[PDB]
Amino acid sequence: MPELAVQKVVVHPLVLLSVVDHFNRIGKVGNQKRVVGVLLGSWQKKVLDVSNSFAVPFDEDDKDDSVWFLDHDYLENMYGMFKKVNARERIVGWYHTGPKLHKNDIAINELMKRYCPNSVLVIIDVKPKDLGLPTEAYISVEESKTFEHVTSEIGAEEAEEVGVEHLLRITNQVHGLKGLNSKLLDIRSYLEKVATGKLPINHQIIYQLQDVFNLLPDVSLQEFVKAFYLKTNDQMVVVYLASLIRSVVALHNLINNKIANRDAEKKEGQEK
Amino acid sequence: STPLLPEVEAYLQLLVVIFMMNSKRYKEAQKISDDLMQKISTQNRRALDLVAAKCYYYHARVYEFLDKLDVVRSFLHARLRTATLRHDADGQATLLNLLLRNYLHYSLYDQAEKLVSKSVFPEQANNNEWARYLYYTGRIKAIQLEYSEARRTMTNALRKAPQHTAVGFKQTVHKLLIVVELLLGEIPDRLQFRQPSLKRSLMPYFLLTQAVRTGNLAKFNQVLDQFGEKFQADGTYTLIIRLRHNVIKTGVRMISLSYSRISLADIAQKLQLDSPEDAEFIVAKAIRDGVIEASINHEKGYVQSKEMIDIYSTREPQLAFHQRISFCLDIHNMSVKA
């Protein structure tokens, strides 16, 4: 089944491409700035549907994280024109490129908060971090800075979907290993850090691992599984029995076809 | 092609005619065949569309009865060389079948091992065109005691061939087929057996099969004495001895009851009929073997065994599903082939 959540974000494919285009066109890139914009869209009962976006200019200092420049007024006037075009376009959130977070992320957030308590922050990188979905969404309010593993899926309107198409187990398994490796890197990292007296001293991180191990996996290993297994083969044995029968049934329908083809050919003179 | 065919056919007609019109015995027409056989010798690679087995074939059948015309081997051996292997394959393959027969009847099946090794070398033919190949092939394997393998080959032989000369050929295959069930020790139902072969002929095999199913030795000996002849006739004698073992082996198997103890005494009473008093020794062999398994105390005069209620709870059906799917699947691919 697909993953769903309390709040949910749907981000349109149109939106994503727009960021790709913004990064190359503004031509400011090659200074390695944050490419930031405001996201617009359609929201209802508890669904963010990101219907629209627009880029915002920004210039930040390249030797100070306290000194950055952004204009509010630009947001009102442009918003005003959008309201005039389509009134089904509310302020949902904003976007930042990532792939790392800033202190300053907190600073763009305070502003969007005012306009609506819920401001989604989407971390979008074209440059492929992940070979599944390379876009991840968080929703943040400060305590400190929170995050949320809110689903991201690509819904669409009728027009949007056709355009996409104009332009144009095994998958599971590659991803599965991937995930293992990401955690693996983190442990090696943790060991290093602890060795060299670096901030990690988080209780949570040890706590999650311990429980996880107790359970064990069952697509490998037998160690914890063996008692469960005894039941398991018996159920599988039955599914297979069913499968057998149906293969004969299929085979039979193929015989009917052949006999008919044979008859037809034979009487004709024979020609395929 | 158009001129070739009448000349050969005249030769061919010549041979039909001489049998009991220019003979009165099956050793006088032969003199006439031998001079005509020259023709085959003469054209080498100027042809490949031929049949050339017949002359040699008529000569040859007679040696199979128990007569002396063993000269013929020399002749077939030369022919396998004349065809290169890479040239004139289909005709070579037919010849190899007739040589293989001659050898099978009389002595050393070992020379067939080799023949088989030849048989799989680059050909432009197939060895399943005349089922007779399978029949010979089966006896070889039978001796060696692969009951299963012989079964496959024989059964494939029965497919796509009888509906004419079903008369003689089904009877020979059918007699061996029955024997193989006895040898394997797994014997099917009595209903089935009736309809194969000629009914009169079916009868000696049936008496034998029934005795083996009862699993009692004395009846097996009495019937066997009457039917010395069949084994002799066939040219496969070794079977007569081999079957003796099988009765006893079925008999222990037959007697499988249920309970954590069966008295040793009980087994011994049933067993008394099979063998005078060689009972425990047989039983021990059987348990050890792993066909059945048990613990015996002669001390407490009981046999203790394992219980089973756990069938269908372990891999034995898993093997079955896999084997069964496969049969259906080959034909499903096959229908598409057309």
* Alpha-carbon span A61 to A110, nearest angstrom: 19
Chain A residues within 8 A of B317 when measuring between CB atoms:
237, 241
Report which of B251, B250, B203, B245 is spatially closest to residue B226, judged by C-alpha positions.
B203
Same domain, A241 and A127: no
* Alpha-carbon span A50 to A42, nearest angstrom: 6
Same domain, A28 and A155: yes
Instruction: Considering only the C-alpha atoms of chain A, give the largest distance between any 2 of them, rounded to a whole number of Å.
Output: 90
Same domain, A154 and A229: no
- Helix B217-226 and helix B239-254: axis angle, to 10°? 160
Number of domains within chain A = 2
A89, part of any domain: yes
Asked whether A75 and A56 are in contact (CB, 8 A), the reply is yes
Q: Do A237 and B317 touch (CB under 8 A)?
A: yes
Same domain, A130 and A10: yes
A1, part of any domain: no
Q: Is A244 within 8 Å of chain B by CB? A: yes
Phi, psi for A241 (deg, rounded to 5): -60, -40
CA closest to A242 among chain B residues: B321
Q: Do B321 and A254 touch (CB under 8 A)?
A: no
Report which of A95, A97, A8, A11 is spatially closest to residue A54, judged by C-alpha positions.
A95
A198, part of any domain: no
**Amino acid (one-letter) located at A38:** V
Q: Do B338 and A254 touch (CB under 8 A)?
A: no
A134, part of any domain: yes
How many angstroms away from the CA of B220 is the closest CA of chain A?
42
- In whole angstroms, what separates CA B200 from the centre of its chain? 21
Asked whether B303 and B291 are in contact (CB, 8 A), the reply is no
Q: Do B328 and A261 touch (CB under 8 A)?
A: no
Same domain, A159 and A222: no
DSSP B290: T
Q: Do A247 and B331 touch (CB under 8 A)?
A: no
A192, part of any domain: no
Q: Tell me the structure's resolution in angstroms, rounded to a single decimal.
A: 6.8
Same domain, A139 and A255: no
Same domain, A73 and A156: yes
How many angstroms away from the CA of B327 is the closest CA of chain A?
10
CA closest to A252 among chain B residues: B332
* Alpha-carbon span A135 to B149, nearest angstrom: 61
A228, part of any domain: yes
Structural element, H or E, at residue B281: helix B279-289
Asked whether A9 and A120 are in contact (CB, 8 A), the reply is yes
Question: Which of A168, A191, A214 represents a domain boundary (last residue)?
Answer: A168
**Amino acid (one-letter) located at A184:** L
N- to C-terminal Cα distance for chain B?
31
Strand, coil or helix: what is A94?
strand
A57, part of any domain: yes
The answer for residues whose C-beta is within 8 angstroms of residue B134's C-beta and 6 or more apart is: B128, B153, B154, B156, B157
Tokens of B129: 């065109």
A177, part of any domain: no
The answer for residues whose C-beta is within 8 angstroms of residue B158's C-beta and 6 or more apart is: B131, B170, B173
Domain that holds residue A53: 6-168
Q: Do B328 and A257 touch (CB under 8 A)?
A: no
- Helix B279-289 and helix B239-254: axis angle, to 10°? 80
DSSP B87: S
Same domain, A164 and A220: no
Mutation choice for A interface testing from B310, B319, B321 by most A CBs within 10 A: B321
Same domain, A226 and A138: no
Question: Which of A142, A168, A194 represents a domain boundary (last residue)?
Answer: A168
Beta bridge partners of A139: A120
Asked whether B236 and B177 are in contact (CB, 8 A), the reply is no
Same domain, A163 and A240: no
* Alpha-carbon span A152 to B199, nearest angstrom: 79
Same domain, A27 and A120: yes
**Structure solved using which method?**
cryo-EM
- Contacts of A22-30 with C-beta under 8 Å, sequence gap 24+, read A22/A55, A23/A97, A23/A126, A26/A55, A26/A57
How many angstroms away from the CA of A246 is the closest CA of chain B?
10
**Amino acid (one-letter) located at B97:** N
With tokens 């009134």, the residue in question is A87
- Helix B264-274 and helix B279-289: axis angle, to 10°? 110
CA closest to A234 among chain B residues: B313
Cis check for the bond before A99: say yes or no (omega within 30 of 0).
yes
Degrees, nearest 5: CA angle A21-A25-A29: 105
* Alpha-carbon span A192 to A197, nearest angstrom: 9
Beta bridge partners of A50: A11
Beta carbons within 10 angstroms of residue A84's beta carbon? 8
Burial B121-159 (b: 16+ CB within 10 A, else e): eeeeeebeeebbbbbbbbbbbbbeebbebbbebbeebbe
Report which of A45, A80, A47 is spatially closest to residue A153, judged by C-alpha positions.
A47
Same domain, A109 and A212: no
Asked whether A64 and A70 are in contact (CB, 8 A), the reply is no
| CB-neighbour burial class of residue B206 (10 A; exposed 0-12, middle 13-18, buried 19+) | middle
Strand, coil or helix: what is B313?
coil
β strands within chain B, DSSP E = 261-263, 294-297, 302-305
Q: Do A240 and B321 touch (CB under 8 A)?
A: yes
Question: Which of A117, A138, A168 represents a domain boundary (last residue)?
Answer: A168
